[model samples]
Target chain A: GPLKPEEHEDILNKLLDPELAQSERTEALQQLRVNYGSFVSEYNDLTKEKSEFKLELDDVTSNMEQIIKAKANLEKMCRTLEDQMNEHRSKAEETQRSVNDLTSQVEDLEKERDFYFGKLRNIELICQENEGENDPVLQRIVDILYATDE
Target chain B: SGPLKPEEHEDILNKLLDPELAQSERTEALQQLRVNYGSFVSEYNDLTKEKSEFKLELDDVTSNMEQIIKAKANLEKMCRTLEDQMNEHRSKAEETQRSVNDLTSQVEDLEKERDFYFGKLRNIELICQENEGENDPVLQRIVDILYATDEGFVIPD
Candidate 1:
């Protein structure tokens, strides 16, 4: 490999020595020490941004999960509401069926009512019997359809 | 002591090249080089792991946001559709109410007609008192045919 992990370890191990330090080597190490704090400081600043970005991303993700759950519940509510509406539409159609039947049947029933009432009015004129106490002809008329069983 | 920085790494590199540097400086420089290299590897490895985790977390969260947005839009559409159905329900309810009124009127009219029919039937007996025991045969025969036909309204005993 272009990079050697063990070789890098070996290189770092060379600085582990505490025995018999030199002036120039100590000065060099000292110079690096001053630069090291600044260098690490810069890295710390960059790492702060990295972690901040991660934090923002993480919290936004949590918000996303919340909305996702709400949408799921909304989906269920919509499904149930849609079902109710469909059932209503079906029931309406059934009831509309009754309305149509009644529409025509009402005309027939009104005609029948008119026929019976016209007959009753003409009877009192012909017989000149205007009082209820004097009339059994109306009772006979009530039994007209019934007496046919005889 | 701490791990060497980049400048430390470079300083040790110079010591290694020194043809006549002191023995202790030489010895310590080599150690610094190895130590700095180890530090570099350690720092680089930590950074690499952090970057990977960041990419994974960001990508996962970002994609999650996109899916949630889409779902929210779909939910709105479903809500609208449900409203339309309820509106239909509203109209259907009104229609049924109209039907009920129409049927009610029919029953009301039918009851009034029955009262009128009974009153007229009673008046017939008074008209026939002048000619006792003589009922109209035309009326009698009409009754006979009415009962014999379909739609006969006989009250069951």
Candidate 2:
């Protein structure tokens, strides 16, 4: 089975010897052919299995390549996202500055409005003190001053 | 006819070995022996050729198996390494996505606050515009503050 020629040499010699009995030669040839056929069958199965292994290996290799590509693409996407995130962060800080500036301006504007409103009220009190209660023109001026609607 | 039965084969050999056989009988016997010998030799040659072919095929398959095994081992190692790298990338990408989400949220919040303050300023400007025709000194002061730039307050007529 392992192909040791020394063991088969004697059997082969007997097979070739014409002086040997026909039974002996036929029996020897039968045994040899059977062994050979069995080996051929085994090799055929091995070849088939090897082919299947090759196909599976190829598929796995292909899949591994796709994974490699995907991993690279993911890395690139992450970097791009990181850049976008940094830009957004910077814009957010800029917006924060705008908010701070607008807050200060709004507070100032509110204080100015409050101060002007207080002054206008004081002027109305002085007008009421100096003018007669039935003075329609001064009353009209006070009405206009206090008006808020467009 | 290629391989005779033991009975036929023994009969042919016996006649060929007998010295007392007639010339014609011995000639027929030798011819038969030659025919059987030729058939046997042809079969042996055919078998030998088939055996060598099988051996070659076996050698080819064996060598291919070794190569495939080596290739499979290398590819498996590569797959593992790539898997690790892919996982690393995945983790990093998730982290980056989280940061992006946080930044996006912060930006939205900042924009909202800025708009709120801008609305307040616009309201004050509108109120000042409404009373601008009155030319009241209080209103004038409000307009001065409303249109003020870095140089300070202005009294725009």
Candidate 3:
């Protein structure tokens, strides 16, 4: 209920009694403090929770950014790997072509070398068969061949 | 010493009606009581409002904290999967790169061997051409020099 102003005039006069008012005001303020304490305790509790939760919220937010960066890096790495794989595959292809070309050339060389070896073996066999001949061209060829063999 | 409770209105009225108390004292005590009550009521109202706001803030934080836990979990998992992929890609790159190098290096070895064999074959062919003039003394001498039992075929010993 509202206190009338007329009553307040009287309360002013009573409080003019300084020591009496002091003790009364002191007690009244102490009682009011108890009431305020309940609110203060609740305020303090909420403040602590707010701070911690805000911190955690920030932590997760940064974690989101970190993952996003990692995703970008992963994509870039995958692209590089794919590019490198293609390069390796193409290089192997080129090497296979060169090896095939060389195998053909080596096959031809093998046939020619075998023919040359046959001609050389025939000459050596005829020289061995004419070992005692005294004819001029045959003797000369035999001497030269024997000397070549030596 | 403090103000009376709102429920003590009867006591206040009864005390004010008594004549043993000075009229001014009765009026003054009630006025002081009214003043103290006003203060307590005003302060309590504001504090209650403040407490309500803080509670709302707490609720907001509680819900936010819960959501971030899930977010954190998802982010960490995604990072792990990507990290594994990154590692696997690295391993594949190295193995494939080695295959590229090994095959190319083998081609190089084959080329070197083919070139050397080609050089020797050409040398053998040149020796055959020289031997074609079988009756020529200089050519015969060259042949003897080449295939002498103690010497190299064309690269003179």
Candidate 4:
């Protein structure tokens, strides 16, 4: 560690101690040398630790950015998908509505078919009762009633 | 009591080194060293505590980032599923539309055919009604056919 202002003051004050014995003075200097060595080692270690943390922090921040970007992309994709879903649902609803309309049309047409068939049946009965299938004029009407492409 | 001055430092060192220095100056130097050492220890401990707290905060942030990544993956998968469903719905809607188109055409053709048949029947009925009763055998026979409803008669055709 680089000396803090207070730590520097402490080291300087300790070295200025006057009453200490010569042997004690030598021991204090040796201790100062050892403390400086340890402080330098600790400083290097702390610096390396801070660098590692910085790299880790940067990596985490980058990941956060990527996550945000991905979230936006997915959110946009979801919106598009939902829009398409709604569009298809609308188309299905409209097409089904047409099917219902065509069904009613077919029913009405069938009713008209039945109405004409009944009318022709009455005409056929009159012709058969009066002429017993012998009249050419009555036969023509019957032929038309039962007409087919065949 | 204030910061260590360079001149003060040199004066104190010379006094401490000289065997002739008075006892009171040695006692004052020892007291200053104790005071500065105590304050230095306090600052050092606080710094260590702050570093530890920072490391813990970093760990928490990293964990949160991982969670965000997982959540993003899940969201992407869900979006893909939504797209697939949209495509399926589109195909089904198109198929239904085709069926409806075919049905509509068939209904229209049926309507036209029914109308054509009704027209011919209506014409015959009008002619028969106009010539009702008394005259040619052919007209009489046609008139009878128009109105007859005998249960004994079975129409075959």
When candidate 2 is compared with the true two-chain complex, its DockQ is 0.05
Off by over 4 Å in 1: A7-53, A56-60, A101-105, A128-150, B1-5, B16-21, B118-157
Question: What ranges in model 4 sit over 4 Å off?
Answer: A1-18, A21-34, A132-150, B1-57, B60-64, B128-157
Q: Of the true interface contacts, what fraction does each candidate have? A: 0.37, 0.00, 0.00, 0.56
Tens digit per residue, CA lDDT, model 3, A1-150:
222334443454444445675876455444433443444355445556556656665666566567656656665665665565556556555655665666665555554444444444545555456555543444444443334211
- Candidate 1: tens digits of C-alpha lDDT, residues B1-157: 5455556666776786566888788788776665664565467457656767887788888887887888798889878978897887868867796886778688677757655654554444344344345665545543343333224432222
Residue A83, candidate 3: C-alpha displacement in angstroms: 16
| Candidate with best TM-score | 4
lDDT of 4 by residue, A12-98 (tens): 556655676676566655554455455545644555676677677778778788888879888888898989988997898899889
Q: Evaluated on chain B only, what are the TM-scores of all the candidate structures, in order?
A: 0.61, 0.56, 0.61, 0.56
In candidate 1, clashing pairs total: 15
- The per-candidate count of clashes, in order, stands at 15, 0, 1, 4
Tell me how candidate 1 scores on lDDT. 0.61
- Enumerate the candidates' DockQ scores in order: 0.24, 0.05, 0.06, 0.34
lDDT of 4 by residue, B45-148 (tens): 55566667668868988888878888888888888888887888899799999989898898979977797876776667776565555465666655554454
**For candidate 1, lDDT tens digit of each residue in A87-144?**
8888787777777777676766666556555554444343344335555654444443
The residue pairs that clash in candidate 3, if any, are: A150-B149
TM-score of each: 0.61, 0.37, 0.42, 0.64
Candidate 3 lDDT over B9-38, as tens digits, reads: 435544654569987878865565556656
